[PDB]
Amino acid sequence: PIETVPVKLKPGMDGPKVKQWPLTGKISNPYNTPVFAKLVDFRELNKRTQDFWEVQLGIPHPAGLKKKKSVTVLDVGDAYFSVPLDEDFRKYTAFYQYNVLPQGWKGSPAIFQSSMTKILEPFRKQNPDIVIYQYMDDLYVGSDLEIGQHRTKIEELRQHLLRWGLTTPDKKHQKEPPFLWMGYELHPDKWTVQPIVLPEKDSWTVNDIQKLVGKLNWASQIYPGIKVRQLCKLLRGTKALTEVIPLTEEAELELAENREILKEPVHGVYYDPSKDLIAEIQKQGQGQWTYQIYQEPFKNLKTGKYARMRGAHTNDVKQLTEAVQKITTESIVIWGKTPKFKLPIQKETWETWWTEYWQATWIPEWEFVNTPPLVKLWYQLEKEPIVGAETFYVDGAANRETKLGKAGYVTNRGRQKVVTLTDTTNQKTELQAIYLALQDSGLEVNIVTDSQYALGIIQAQPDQSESELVNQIIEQLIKKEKVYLAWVPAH
Amino acid sequence: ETVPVKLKPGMDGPKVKQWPLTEEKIKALVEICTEMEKEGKISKIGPENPYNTPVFAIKKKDSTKWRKLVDFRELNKRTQDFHPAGLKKKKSVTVLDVGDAYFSVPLDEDFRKYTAFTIPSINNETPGIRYQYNVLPQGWKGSPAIFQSSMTKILEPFRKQNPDIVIYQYMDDLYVGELHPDKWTVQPIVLPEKDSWTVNDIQKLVGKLNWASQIYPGIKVRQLCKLLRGTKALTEVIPLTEEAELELAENREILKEPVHGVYYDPSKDLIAEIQKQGQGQWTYQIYQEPFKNLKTGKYARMRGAHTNDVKQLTEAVQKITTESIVIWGKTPKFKLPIQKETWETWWTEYWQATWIPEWEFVNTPPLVKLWYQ
Ligand SMILES: Cc1cccc([C@]23SCCN2C(=O)c2ccccc23)c1
């Protein structure tokens, strides 16, 4: 006898009137629903049933749990059958109608959840330091009480629940820690990801290679150093999920490598709200960033890898910024607060950057950590034209259909050059002309262009791009002593 | 008793995701709601209710007590339907948060489910607490309209005893003509004035003038571009042929006042762009049709923000919205020069208004910035 959840059907609809398929106190009228073996097909009813508030679609991260001296899991049997179905909505379930939440119905998981929350509320009020986590049919109960007092408390919970018809496994039949939940291995004082066995094969198909890479990633969450690049060349051009791909010489290397890394076990400690949160970020190769979050030096709560080209043209500062933004977003979810950052960029580099970037950009409280490689700015465009430096008036243009173009320049000093391009685009020819001025000029240049497009890319100080051409332009720019780019209207 | 309110025909309630909130804000909301429930303002809801609205906490102008803020933007776009041209001329307008009044009035019982909102829990450790208003909620467009006949009926004596002062109501606020709108000025385009001019100088000038001619076609750069004929050193000084001096003069004159034929049409969306200049400076333009600016402005950061671009932006955005309401009686749609996630993460930290304007994120062109400062 737990309060009943009222339920209607989507406006302008009526209960399922689906004929019965010919075949061979929880249930007691123009409707009917298919039933056989006892599995009911409520697909039609569900398509008639109103919408309910989402079920727990976001699960907790171990990194954000607090240490408990003892933990227990209680699986609730006959969960759904233990809760009453809206008296009025009962008719629409005829098949003999239900009096309880039906297995396989739309609002069952939700109403059950809502019910459990209301049943737990009392017991919770009385037990403020006993933490209960509801996850489908399971009840995870942790506390800081010693082994015996804890057992006594679980027994209270079991009885409270029993008052409501909810039965649970006694101490003898309960499952004991650690808990294997959603790819994790939970201990009352430490966590980790469940066992990772890299198959030792001599015949790998596409399905094996993909699953492997699949397992590898999920581990990187705690095992920094793993690599998947030399395996992720094994999929290129694969004809089918059963095509057996021979592990290249380098493919057995990376694997053997990871295989070894995975041999040494690493455990994530839990969260202590009395201490500060701290995240440190390293630049692990161009475009790849790593990070670890902790409260005590080396006792990581969570660690991670980022590799996201936010577009096509960026730099380490912008990349550093985004990494910080993602870590911040995770942090708010998991712990409810932003960690203090330890970043590999000097205050003055960051200052120079955000102060003159056209986009509002910000980084929460952080401090420089001197760990090479440091993120810096590879070149700074001159704020005013350079005296004594040659001036290149560049120009590019390509017919958008023949993809035929020309790019070149003319300097104040009489220097001129015109190159013909093929299979090019206007933009590419505009970039090309700038490229040329840079190539053929000294350590100091004044470059005039009519390309807003090129002007924009370059002014943003990119240092990494997908465009080979933009990358050549960066290389040149890094070499120059002074470069002043200036725009002028075209035509 | 309650007045029947409804969603626009055929439409349904809002199911907008709740953004993650910090521990501080969650505790804050939890304390605020627990009492609101005690006063019957809000009441817990079951799973039978599929709707939702985002909520967060803010801290009003120089106040230390938390203010629950519900982003009813979605519910407002779906709520069925139901300006003092002198206000902008007033010497001093004051903003009075008269949002609490709404609580005294009950909300149609049939409409309440659409006001559903959720208070999240850190790390999803719990299912979150769900409520729905039983009274006119703060920040909903229905509330000010419903509490209208009543709001006037109480401001009947003051505007008859003082029919001089203007009273304007926009959502949860009251504007009595602390703003000083008689000092609001539109940033006019401005060409450089210099002793000497280098090739570079004239180029930039010709550039700005080219752009400016999109708004003022009378502008001519013919004479100036001749002084550019040839391929000379950027740093090479160029004396102005007199034909140019005059060409530069007319342009100046043309840019001494806003362009003609620029009226405000209340049947069109009001748009606002913002550019980050630097040195904590921010330009903006309000228009409805490209190049036909209803207003152009400038914003200087306030203290305690020198190190924070996002605060500046949000402060600027609120500054600009206030001007919109104080002038047209509407909030514009913002084109925010900032990465969506950066913004969506901290805006709620520097926000103090009770309304939330609409926004989108852009990639400001280099040129346009050189043209607005
Ligand atoms: C998200 C989740 C899943 C399973 C168990 C828990 C659980 S059981 C009760 C809540 N949790 C804790 O505080 C905790 C700490 C260490 C181990 C287990 C737990 C939490």
Swiss-Prot record, chain B:
| Gene (UniProt) | gag-pol
Variant or mutagenesis effect after changing G278D: Confers resistance to abacavir, lamivudine and zidovudine
Task: Tell me what the record says results from P106S.
Answer: Confers resistance to lodenosine
Impact of changing S63Y on the protein? Confers multi-NRTI resistance
What are the top taxonomic ranks of the organism?
Answer: Viruses, Riboviria, Pararnavirae, Artverviricota, Revtraviricetes
Impact when changing Y175H = Confers resistance to atevirdine, efavirenz, loviride and zidovudine
Indicate the annotated site residue(s) for Essential for RT p66/p51 heterodimerization.
Answer: W346, W359
What does the UniProt record report as the effect of altering V166D in this chain? Confers resistance to efavirenz, tivirapine and trovirdine
Record annotation: effect of changing S63N:
Confers multi-NRTI resistance
Note the effect listed for K90N: Confers resistance to atevirdine, efavirenz, emivirine and nevirapine
User: Changing G177Q: reported impact?
Assistant: Confers resistance to efavirenz, HBY 097 and nevirapine
**Coiled coil (residue ranges):** none
Indicate the impact reported for D62S: Confers multi-NRTI resistance
Q: Where is this motif: Tryptophan repeat motif?
A: 343-359
Question: Changing G177V does what?
Answer: Confers resistance to efavirenz and nevirapine
The record gives the effect of mutating D62G as: Confers multi-NRTI resistance
- Tell me what effect the entry lists for E125K: Confers resistance to emivirine
Please describe, based on the UniProt annotation, the reported consequence of changing V93M: Confers resistance to delavirdine, efavirenz and nevirapine
Q: What is the effect of changing T331I?
A: Confers resistance to abacavir, lamivudine and zidovudine
User: Reported effect of changing K88Q?
Assistant: Confers resistance to efavirenz
Annotated ranges, domain Reverse transcriptase:
39-179
Q: Where does Mg(2+) 1 bind?
A: D97, D172, D173
At the top level, the lineage of the source is Viruses
**This chain belongs to which protein, by name?**
p51 RT
* Annotated consequence of substituting V95I: Confers resistance to efavirenz, emivirine, nevirapine and trovirdine
The listed outcome for Y175C is: Confers resistance to nevirapine
Q: What is the effect of changing G177T?
A: Confers resistance to efavirenz, HBY 097 and nevirapine
